[PDB]
Amino acid sequence: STGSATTTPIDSLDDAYITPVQIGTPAQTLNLDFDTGSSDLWVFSSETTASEVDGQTIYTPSKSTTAKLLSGATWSISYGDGSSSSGDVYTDTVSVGGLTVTGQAVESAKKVSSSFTEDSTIDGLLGLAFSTLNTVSPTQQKTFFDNAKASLDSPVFTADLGYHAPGTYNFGFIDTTAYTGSITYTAVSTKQGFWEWTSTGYAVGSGTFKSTSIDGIADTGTTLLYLPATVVSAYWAQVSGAKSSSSVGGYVFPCSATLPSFTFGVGSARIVIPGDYIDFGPISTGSSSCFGGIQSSAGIGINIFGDVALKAAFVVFNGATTPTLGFASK
Ligand SMILES: O=C([C@@H]1CCCNC1)N1CCCCC1
Ligand SMILES: O=C([C@H]1CCCNC1)N1CCCCC1
């Protein structure tokens, strides 16, 4: 089997991407944030505290003939931006882009934090990291990808995110029309439950490439590119007037600037992030200070190749027995 679904930015800055997902019988379509940095499929639901729902589409398990309470199971997750959610669990039929998993754990939110409530366009998350991070207790549950894997033509999924445009998540096949040149594969460590890999270095704009190992995760659920302070300082030093602002919470730059590109290494290959991809616009409406799309990972504890980096590439998440990651230009 295979699946193919379009993923669409939620706003003009590509702050996140949503992908339609069919849950239950008859289908209830919710728009989920596909997150290769976590491993819970959770949704706004008929059980979510009413005051915490503001425009989201909800899953109602009582209206699904295939829904079954997973008795005694609960979940609770805290994300790296300080957001959180928790609730109980149903199993139901879940389909993505034509690919169907029966008996998928669908985690029904009873509580969500304010940042979820405030984002009316995101109806929940679909985790695509390794199932060892799944928070369901007392019986840990598998991700949609892990459940689908054995049925897929090939044990892979791909992320092809757009810059200010829709893109695609494919399951079970590599679309050879969706990228240019060849795909470079690189080793993955699953020790922390993430798609964790080591970049071979970077360049700023037209500058020379610096060979240096940068361990980090491929995380479609993180908006920005978070890298070591040394690397980030070298980038922003090439932008007149850029500075790190503790009051704003990161690097800002004059909105009048033309940003340089940023290149990262994948083995001997190179992925170029155009300068425009690094512009996240005014810090507040009408401001002439703009927020940077490359930020320091210091204090996070891990480097994160988020959407700013991933959308510059066609990315293969290879879930073979020894997982790997592939990157191609596009
Ligand atoms: O919570 C997260 C991210 C949040 C955004 C969505 N992807 C998962 N983590 C990844 C980075 C290290 C801390 C854990
Ligand atoms: O929002 C944040 C951090 C970055 C700034 C310091 N506190 C919040 N991140 C995005 C999600 C993955 C971890 C990094």
Side-chain angles (χ1 to χ4, degrees), residues 201-204 210 212 214 227-237 262 294:
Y202 71 99
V204 176
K210 175 72 170 182
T212 187
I214 306 169
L227 292 173
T230 47
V231 178
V232 178
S233 182
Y235 178 81
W236 289 109
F262 183 89
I294 295 175

Side-chain angles (χ1 to χ4, degrees), residues 49-62 64-67 69-110 112-117:
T49 298
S51 63
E52 295 180 352
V53 183
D54 186 7
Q56 295 82 11
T57 294
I58 61 165
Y59 168 59
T60 303
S62 67
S64 175
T65 61
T66 42
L69 182 69
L70 186 62
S71 184
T74 58
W75 63 282
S76 182
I77 194 158
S78 301
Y79 297 103
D81 64 342
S83 69
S84 63
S85 53
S86 60
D88 55 16
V89 188
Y90 293 82
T91 56
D92 211 337
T93 304
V94 171
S95 302
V96 175
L99 171 65
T100 299
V101 168
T102 56
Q104 175 62 47
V106 179
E107 301 174 34
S108 170
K110 289 184 163 184
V112 301
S113 64
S114 60
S115 286
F116 287 118
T117 299

Side-chain angles (χ1 to χ4, degrees), residues 35-38 78-81 125 194 217 219 221-222 300 302 304:
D35 181 12
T36 63
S38 70
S78 301
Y79 297 103
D81 64 342
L125 265 65
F194 300 118
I217 66 167
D219 186 1
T222 290
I300 299 177
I302 200 158
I304 309 171

Side-chain angles (χ1 to χ4, degrees), residues 264-297:
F264 64 95
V266 184
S268 60
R270 308 288 181 253
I271 299 298
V272 182
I273 305 172
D276 288 345
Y277 290 26
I278 299 161
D279 177 17
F280 278 76
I283 58 170
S284 296
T285 305
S287 178
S288 70
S289 292
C290 277
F291 197 67
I294 295 175
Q295 296 294 345
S296 178
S297 63

Side-chain angles (χ1 to χ4, degrees), residues 113-146:
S113 64
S114 60
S115 286
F116 287 118
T117 299
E118 292 163 3
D119 193 343
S120 65
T121 66
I122 292 176
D123 300 326
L125 265 65
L126 188 149
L128 291 167
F130 291 90
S131 291
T132 52
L133 295 176
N134 176 266
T135 77
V136 178
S137 179
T139 309
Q140 191 172 54
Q141 300 293 305
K142 293 185 170 191
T143 70
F144 175 83
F145 178 55
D146 267 355

Side-chain angles (χ1 to χ4, degrees), residues 119-148 150-190 192-242 244-301:
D119 193 343
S120 65
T121 66
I122 292 176
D123 300 326
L125 265 65
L126 188 149
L128 291 167
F130 291 90
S131 291
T132 52
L133 295 176
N134 176 266
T135 77
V136 178
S137 179
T139 309
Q140 191 172 54
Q141 300 293 305
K142 293 185 170 191
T143 70
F144 175 83
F145 178 55
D146 267 355
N147 280 326
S151 304
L152 296 178
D153 291 357
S154 179
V156 304
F157 70 89
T158 65
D160 180 10
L161 304 179
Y163 169 67
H164 296 172
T168 307
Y169 281 103
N170 292 329
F171 292 82
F173 73 105
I174 287 159
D175 180 358
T176 57
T177 73
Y179 60 88
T180 62
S182 58
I183 305 176
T184 298
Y185 289 86
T186 196
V188 164
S189 172
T190 62
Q192 294 193 102
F194 300 118
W195 292 91
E196 188 171 359
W197 65 290
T198 300
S199 172
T200 47
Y202 71 99
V204 176
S206 62
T208 62
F209 187 85
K210 175 72 170 182
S211 291
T212 187
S213 295
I214 306 169
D215 179 285
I217 66 167
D219 186 1
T220 59
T222 290
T223 313
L224 305 185
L225 173 52
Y226 293 89
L227 292 173
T230 47
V231 178
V232 178
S233 182
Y235 178 81
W236 289 109
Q238 297 304 309
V239 179
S240 297
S244 180
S245 169
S246 54
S247 59
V248 174
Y251 280 90
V252 296
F253 68 92
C255 293
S256 59
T258 298
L259 298 175
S261 62
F262 183 89
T263 301
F264 64 95
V266 184
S268 60
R270 308 288 181 253
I271 299 298
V272 182
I273 305 172
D276 288 345
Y277 290 26
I278 299 161
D279 177 17
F280 278 76
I283 58 170
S284 296
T285 305
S287 178
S288 70
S289 292
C290 277
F291 197 67
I294 295 175
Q295 296 294 345
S296 178
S297 63
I300 299 177

